[PDB]
Symmetry: D2
Subunit: 283 residues, 4 copies
Amino acid sequence: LTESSTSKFVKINEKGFSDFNIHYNEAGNGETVIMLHGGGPGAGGWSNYYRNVGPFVDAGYRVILKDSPGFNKSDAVVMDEQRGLVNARAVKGLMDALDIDRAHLVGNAMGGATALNFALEYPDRIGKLILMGPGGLGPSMFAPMPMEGIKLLFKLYAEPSYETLKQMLQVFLYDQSLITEELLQGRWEAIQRQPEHLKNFLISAQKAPLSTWDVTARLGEIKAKTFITWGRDDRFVPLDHGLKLLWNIDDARLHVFSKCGAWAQWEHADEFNRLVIDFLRHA
Amino acid sequence: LTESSTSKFVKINEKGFSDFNIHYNEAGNGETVIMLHGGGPGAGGWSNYYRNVGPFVDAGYRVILKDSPGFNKSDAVVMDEQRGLVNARAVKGLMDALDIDRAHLVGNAMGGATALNFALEYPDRIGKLILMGPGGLGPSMFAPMPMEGIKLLFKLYAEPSYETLKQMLQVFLYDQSLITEELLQGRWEAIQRQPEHLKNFLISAQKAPLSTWDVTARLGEIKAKTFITWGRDDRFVPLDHGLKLLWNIDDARLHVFSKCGAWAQWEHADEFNRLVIDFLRHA
Amino acid sequence: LTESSTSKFVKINEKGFSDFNIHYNEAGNGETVIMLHGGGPGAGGWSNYYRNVGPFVDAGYRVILKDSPGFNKSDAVVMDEQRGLVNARAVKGLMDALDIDRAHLVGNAMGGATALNFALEYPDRIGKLILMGPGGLGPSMFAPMPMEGIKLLFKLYAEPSYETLKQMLQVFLYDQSLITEELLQGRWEAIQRQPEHLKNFLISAQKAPLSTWDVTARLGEIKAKTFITWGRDDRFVPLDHGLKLLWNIDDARLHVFSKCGAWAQWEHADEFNRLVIDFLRHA
Amino acid sequence: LTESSTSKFVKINEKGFSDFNIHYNEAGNGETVIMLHGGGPGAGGWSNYYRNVGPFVDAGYRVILKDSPGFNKSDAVVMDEQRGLVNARAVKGLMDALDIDRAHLVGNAMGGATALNFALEYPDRIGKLILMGPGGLGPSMFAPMPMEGIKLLFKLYAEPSYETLKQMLQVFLYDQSLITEELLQGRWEAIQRQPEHLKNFLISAQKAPLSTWDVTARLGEIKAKTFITWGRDDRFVPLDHGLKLLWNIDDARLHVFSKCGAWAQWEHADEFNRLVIDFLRHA
Ligand code: NA
Ligand code: NA
Ligand code: NA
Ligand code: NA
C-alpha cells in the first residue's frame, strides 16, 4: 500500500463545516477503523500510521487514515473551539459523507482528544475506542505543564525550521536512532507545503487554549469498550493521564510500553498492532 | 482437565531442601510454563490457575501448576529466609528433578516474588517472565502498608474461620458476586486439611518479615522479556509497584485491568489468557 | 479550657434550615477560625480539635469548634444533598447568627469537603482555607475505593459496637498506642447518646452518595490562600488527592506528615499547630 | 551582608583531598547551618542562597554557604566517583578544618545528594537534614529521564552561551519574570570566569554517571530529623522523589510549594525561610 494509491478526498457538511475538504488514505473493505493523528507541525494520517495500515487491513478492517481540518491535505481552518471537539465533528461529517454507520477509532494525543470528543458527542456512531497518549485531559498530578513536547510543538509552529523539527522529533521518540532523514524530510515537506496550517494553528491556539480541551468531567458517559496505550517515556502527554482514563471510563484497560515516546503505534508498531487487533476482535 | 487427573508429586533436593515433596498439576507437552500462586491461607496451584491451564495447554504449552513449599499438598516447612527466594530454589529443584532446562514463569503476588527471585538467581533457566501484582517490592509511594489484604491474610492465618476467609476473599476480588460457595469451600478445605501450613507461615513471617523480600535494587539484572499485569483495584499489592517494575526492568510492559482485584488471571481470565499467550508466542 | 466551659448553642436559618440547633465550642476573642470535623460515628467539634483549640486561642484567634448537622450535639437531620454542601450552608447560618463577617476554616475529611464547599459558595465570607485529608474529591489515581476507613465508617454506622469502633480507630490512626480507653469511651458515648444520628447518616448516604460530593471541577474558582495537609498513612482519604488540590487551587501548598493517619491535627498536634498558625499569620 | 564581606577560604584534607581550596560565605555565630548548592554551570553558595542567609543569621544561626569542589571559587577537580559522595567528604573536610562538631545541612538538587551522602557517611556530625528537590535518587515513577532541566544543564556545560543560560534558567524557574539581567549576568560571570569547571564536570559526568548517585537503598539508615521541600513545577528533579524520601526516611515531612521550580529557597524565599527556621528550632 502507498500514500498515493490510497489517497482520497471527500467534502464535508457538519455544523460549521460547509463543503470542507478532508483528505484521507483508505484501504481494506471490512469494519471501519478510523485513525486520527497528533497536532504537531507536519502531522498527517499516512505518515503517522503507515506502520499500522497494512497489518490492520490484513486483519480484515477497512482503515481510514484521516487528516484533521487544518492538517496536511485537508482544508485550512481557524478554530474558535477546542480542537478535539471540532475534529470530532469532522469525523462525523466524514462518516456521513461515506455512509459509515459505526466506526472504531484509534487516536494519539490530539487524535485521542478527537476520539474522546467523538465518543461523547456521538455514542451511537462509535464501536471500540482506542487511545494512545490522548491529549486534552487537564493538569497532570506529576508533570509540570506545558509538557516538554508541547513547548517544542509551539516553538516549531512559530519558528519553523528543519533544525527545530529535529529537536522536536528527538523529544517525541524514545529511540533517537529512529530519526532518519526520511522521517525528517517527510515532516519538513508537509510543513513547507502548507505554511498557512502553522499560522492557523497558533491563531486557533489563542482562541481556545489547551485548557479548554479538558473533557475529564464527562468520562463517565463513555460506554465504548476502551483500550488505553501509553509510552512510559512520553514527553508530550503525561503517563498519569493514563490512570485517569482507567479510573473514569467504565470499561477500560491500560497498556504501557517501555522505551516508547509519544508514538506508540510507530515505535512499538508490531506489539501495538497485535494488541489492538486482538482487542478489536475479542474484547 | 481436572485437579485429580493432573495431580503429580516430585521429591526435590536443592540447597536446604532434602527429599522435599512438591505437589503440582501438569497438562500439555510443549514448552514449559510454570505457574506460581499467592501466599494466603488455602492458596494452591490448581485453584489459583484452573481458569488458565486449559487455554494455555490448548495453545501448545506444557503447564505446571506448582504448590510452593508449605502450601496445599507440598511438604510443610518453616522458613528463615524471605519466601520469594526459598520458593525460587524449590522451582529450580522441581525443574532439575523433571529435566526441564528453561521455563516460562507466571506468578501473582508471592508467586511473582517467586518468579522475580528465580529470574535473578537463575537467568539461564528462565524464558519469559510474567508477573501479576508481584509482592516483595518494598514500600508503596501511595498505599499505606501493610495493605488491606495483607492484614486480612495475617488475620486469617492466626484466627482461621470461614467467616474471616469470606472477608478476605471479598477484599481480594473486585466483583463480590464471584465469591461462590464453591470458591469459599475450596479454600476452606485446603485450610482445614493442613493446619500445620498456617502455624508455619506465621513462624516464617517472624523469621523473615515481608520487608526482607524486597528485591527492587536488583531489577536491572533481569534480562528476561517481562510482562507485568495489575488489577486497578488490587488491595493486596499496590498498583504503583507496577510502575516500579516498568521503569526498572530492561524489557517490560504493563497491562492493567479495570474492575479487577488481586487475581487478574481469575477475574479477567479470557483477556489474561489472550495477552499472555500472545506475549509468549510473539514478544 | 474544657468542653463544658466552652459549650454554646445557636439556632440557624439558612436555606432548608429553620431554627436548626447547632452546638459549638468557642474560646478566644480575635479573628475567627472555624474548625470542622470528619463524618465517622461519634465525631464532634471538641473531641476532634481539643489538641488544637488552646494553642490557637493562645495565638490570638477566636476558635469555634462546630458540630455539623446530624453530628454530636447539633440537631439530627436527613440530607438529600451531598454533605459537604449542606454543612457549608450550616457554617454560613452559624456565621450570620453570630455576626461573623469572614472566618478562617480548618477541616479534615468531611470537614474539608465542608470547607471546600463554603469557599466555593461564599468566597466573600472566608479568609484562609486549611484542609486536612479533605473528602469528596472523586476517584483516587492509586487507591481502590471505597477506602479502607470508609468501609469501616459504614460498618460502624450500620452495626455499632465498641469493638467495631476500636477497629475503626485502629485504621484512622497510624500509632495504635494512641488508642486509649478515654479516646474509645469518648467516641462510644457520642455514639450511644444519639443513635438517631447513625440511622440518619445511612439514610442521607443513600440519597446522595459520596460520588456526588466531588467538587474537583470547581477548584479553579477558589481564591482563598490554601494550606493542604495530609497524613502519609491516611487510610480514609488517599494522599494523591493532596496533589490534586495543589495543582488545581491557585494559591495552595501541601504539607505531608510521616507516620500519620486521618487525624493530622491530633496525631501531629504540635507541628500541625505551628504550621497553621504561622500560615494564618504570615501567608 | 554581602558576598565580598562574607567571603572566606579554607584548605581541606579529607581522603582524596589534599590542601584543597574551598570557598565559602559565612555570617552569624550560633549553631552552624551549612547550605549546599546545585550543579548547573555557574552555580555557587552565595548566588544560590543570598535570599536565605540574612533571615537565618537573624534567627541566630551561623550560616555557611559552601562552594562544592569544582564550583565557583572552590578548586577545580575531576571526579571519578558520584558527586554527592565526593561533595560530602568536602563538607566533612571543611567542618574538621573549622572545628565544627555538628552541622545542620540545607541542600537543593546536587546539594541535596550532598546532604544525603553526608548524613549516611557521617551520622555523628549532622544535626537536622533539609532537602530541596535533592538529586541522585534513581528513576522517577512518572518523569521521563533525563529530566528537562538535566538535558539543559548538560547542553550549557558543553556549549556555554548567555542564550543557552537563559533557556536553562527559564526551565529552572516557574515565574519567568524572575529572570532579571542581574541574575543572568551573575551566572554568566561564574561561567566565564572558570571555564575549566565546565570541562571538568563533563569529564566527571563520564566517569560516574548520575545513575551511580542513587542512594535510595540506604535511606533507612538516616536518623536525622528530615525536612523535604519540593517545587510542584520542578523540571529538574521530579516531584515523586519527594514521596520516595517521605516513605523511606524514618522521621521526614514533605512541603511542596505551588508555582515553584527547582529553587524553592529563592522562588518562595519568605515561606521557605519561615518553615525551615521553625523546623530547626522546634522539630
Ligand atoms: Na541508524
Ligand atoms: Na450469583
Ligand atoms: Na500506652
Ligand atoms: Na520585571
